[PDB]
Amino acid sequence: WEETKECAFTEFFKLAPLASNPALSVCQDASGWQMLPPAGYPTPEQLKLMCGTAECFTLIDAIKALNPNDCILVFGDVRLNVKKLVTEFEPSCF
């Protein structure tokens, strides 16, 4: 995955549909992991919770549908590759 090349700020705007998707709130509240604003990659504790929450799978699929780029999204000190996150999520659960 891309670990150096940074996303243009416009990449953030791709995430807009998530705010009107109920799965976002359910997943974030259940796990303590935040996508908006982005906290980064889920911690193992957060991932455990996400992997047992149907809505987190729904959320991850909804992010995939936005076609996130393979680049580092920079939000203050938070740095993550959203495409990496969503592609690796399902296998990370087991």
Ligand SMILES: [Cl-]
């Ligand atoms: Cl900094």
Ligand code: NI
């Ligand atoms: Ni890589």
